[PDB]
Design a protein around this ligand. Sequence first.
Ligand SMILES: [Mg+2]
Ligand SMILES: [Mg+2]
Ligand SMILES: [Mg+2]
Lengths: 205, 147, 97
Amino acid sequence: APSRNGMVLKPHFHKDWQRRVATWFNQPARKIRRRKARQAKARRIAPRPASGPIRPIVRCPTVRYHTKVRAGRGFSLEELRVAGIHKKVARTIGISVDPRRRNKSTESLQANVQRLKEYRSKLILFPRKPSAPKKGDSSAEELKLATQLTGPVMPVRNVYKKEKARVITEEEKNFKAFASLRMARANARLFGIRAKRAKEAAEQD
Amino acid sequence: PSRLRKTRKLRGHVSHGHGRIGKHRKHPGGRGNAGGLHHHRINFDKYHPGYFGKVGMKHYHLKRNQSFCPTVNLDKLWTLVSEQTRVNAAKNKTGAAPIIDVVRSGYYKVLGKGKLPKQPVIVKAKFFSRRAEEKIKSVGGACVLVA
Amino acid sequence: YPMAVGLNKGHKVTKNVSKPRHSRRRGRLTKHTKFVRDMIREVCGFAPYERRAMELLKVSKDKRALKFIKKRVGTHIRAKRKREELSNVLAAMRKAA
RNA sequence: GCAGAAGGGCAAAAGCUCGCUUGAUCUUGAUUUUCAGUACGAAUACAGACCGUGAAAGCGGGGCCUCACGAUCCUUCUGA
RNA sequence: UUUAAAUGGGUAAGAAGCCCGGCUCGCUGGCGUGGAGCCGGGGUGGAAUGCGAGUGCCUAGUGGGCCACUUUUGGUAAGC
RNA sequence: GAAAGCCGCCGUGGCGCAAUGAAGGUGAAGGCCGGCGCGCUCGCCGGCCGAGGUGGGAUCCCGAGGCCUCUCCAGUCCGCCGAGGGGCACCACCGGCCCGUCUCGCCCGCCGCGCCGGGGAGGUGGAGCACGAGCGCACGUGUUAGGACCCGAAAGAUGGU
RNA sequence: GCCGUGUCGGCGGCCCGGCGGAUCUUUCCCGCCCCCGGGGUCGGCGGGGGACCGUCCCCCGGACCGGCGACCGGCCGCCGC
RNA sequence: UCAGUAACGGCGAGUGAACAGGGAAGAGCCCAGCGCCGAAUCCCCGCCCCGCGGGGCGCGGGACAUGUGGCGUACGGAAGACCCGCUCCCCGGCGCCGCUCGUGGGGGGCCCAAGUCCUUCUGAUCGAGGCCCAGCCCGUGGACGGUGUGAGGCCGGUAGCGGCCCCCGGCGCGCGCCCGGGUCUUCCCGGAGUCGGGUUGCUUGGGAAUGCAGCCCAAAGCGGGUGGUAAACUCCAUCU
Ligand SMILES: [Mg+2]
Ligand SMILES: [Mg+2]
Ligand SMILES: [Mg+2]
């Protein structure tokens, strides 16, 4: 069955696969079924923003992706605690809440508090009949538009710094080299062994 | 295109391009990679040497994110910034060298590749090779390391 | 001079101090619950393996006692914890008399 | 005569007797034979160590040469 | 088996060849020895006949053969 | 119109742009000039540059000389040109570089002087480097897996009458 | 009357011009961190501003061709009436 | 997408996931326990407030239930007492008005223009023709039926065409329900023949056992589970 210089191959067709076949013939039909499920969901709700609540700034895990910024799930009660809004009030203000999320850094904590107060300062509420607590006159003169598009406060905006130009000085052109990588990597794995021989000379008397 | 193929041209001829003697049936050598050590052995060496056996250590559940480091070597290093930077770098004021950080360009390690130009840089990478950083320290540049 | 590999790894941030999440204080003894388990182990008593254990734990030896508790209660981290609270009954039976 | 089946080879010898020895060791490639010009096996010429013998040149990394043997998977021992 | 054909097999019949000058070497070693290598310079018409070659990829069919000179094996011989 | 059109802070991702090792990991630029340390079989500082060298090599460039109704004076052109030059792709060869291992060796470094890091010179193993050629789409041939060019058993299994 | 291409200039339109830049400006403008009610560029943060460079929109001069981009004048030679 | 990858496999033929990442969609909660409230709770029957198209909050009797109904409470903590500065709400039912983004749904019946002149034919929908207004209509030149090939003869098709009948989701009079937040102080704080272990089966890519199941043994409470090589020690992370 094999021949001249070729590829040794494993087609996974040793199983009755013509019954379990999937053809995407309804796929234009479902694209105009979930546009009409977005349009008849936009006009059904309110002047409330389409594509739902405000999402947080979130950094990705796992070395490959930890230099980018992603839209997250909720707002991690500590960030709701500092911003001053209540946890059961917040999801009818338009603010997503994920109670199982942890804040253990401070800079990424203060980023989303700045984000959450910037949202509250660009929000207009409607009283049912015009009582308006925490709210004043005509609704920002009818709120300048109707409904937003694919993100209320532009959820990614992954930004990079300027770091314009520097002068190649001493102690910078001279030290932080490949020897610093090799010695720091070796002391990372010779740490527990060297702390064992130190015990052996501590029980030496 | 059924028009352009061999079976329209081969219709009228008896064995249909397969021979009176051999008379192509279904599976005369077995199905797939059958007999790879026995009767198809001379095919599997001379074209796939290495195909049979254990060769290393097993690592259960590897994650293709722990080992992720892309590389850029030094010829592709000045294209990470504009060409408007390096023409502005060398026009005789002071030792003002630009930054080139490969991490916001999506690279982690800087390898060596000759003809890094005469200007100084400060290059912010996660890792360096020793051929790479001594090309940089010979154009008057610096090699600053980032986590 | 921060770097990725070595012994002080990672980008340097500053830690957020926080009172820990309430789910983590789950198996604490909570003195009324201490009262319920300590009252009910004298109306009910000891299991047959841990009466044989504490009559090996007073006379026979201790390496053979835990070898008997290794087999019946499952693991080693469970066998020592059982062996030390049978010894605290055996100490309270004899030395508190 | 050279252990033996044959053939080739061999005379201050490759035989016979004696004297020391362990090169029947450690390691990388190349090549020949079978051949697809693949493998094992066998062989050849080296190279680098460490050795033996001899006064020395040298010879020796098994048997005077042509035969005497065995993959993957698994087991086992050895090595830094 | 001393001797030993006919047919046959290999190689050679130039410029990648020849000569001269110099210099590198950790190889070799009485020696400006030996041998390799490198650079530079000098002289092209070097058996007959015929012919355009060189090179890579992809590749089907085939893997039962049969006969006749001459040469030969088994067999009494055979359209064996 | 189940089409077509657009997005680009929708390029995430795929393949390619870098290889090698079981792995920890490491990871592809050289030559000259001028000097110096025992110019010590080894090297060091500064400049010039910059993919090395040899043999072939289409094309191109130069080209003495050569070719015209009367002789000495000047112009474009074109054909013939021995010779010489820079040499494409590519082939053969030599050198070089990176990784794995081997042997022999000496030197340098300090977020800390160590059963620490780095370097050297020779030899071998690699699907490498030596100024990138890939990607997407379409077609054709080939091989394979699928009922697989068409038809064909003796069977085996499950559930029933 | 005309547009093609280098060369600019009027920096003109840049503040009543488009876009692009991992160019610059720690003296601009907004909510903050670093110390003794105030303050130090005292190093920046989030954003806006306006310089510079790269390319495209006019005006005067200048360069060539007026190229299948053309009309009028005169010329030559046709053409039907 | 990862990825035909890690991994499994007479390591042969073959098999073969996940986590990041980009999207589609996005919504969160309740209980037993532990405490508190005179069982503050529920079901049935009888006559009524008063009703359409029938279900109730009101009244009176029989049961349920303390072996525990209901309220407030749920691990993101909770409750109570303080103190501090706010605030009077939500829900359905009834009547009708005002809409409904393709312009809400269902149903019926309606809506442009040659059958003109000549001509061929069994029969025309054929062929020719309609002044310098292009013979007529066109938001209608889809389709089909009519003695043959029809924009105009006829259903229709076009059009935010018109009128009809029934039905739906949503404003505003009467019922029904109604103190939240912060700071401090004290008290409270959890699911067992289950986890786990051994062994045997089946299963998985899961490999010194991924999952499941039988049998045996069987917990703890700074505990337990997980951290992809069996085990001991140790630290950390994470979940409950
Ligand atoms: Mg065939
Ligand atoms: Mg064929
Ligand atoms: Mg059967």
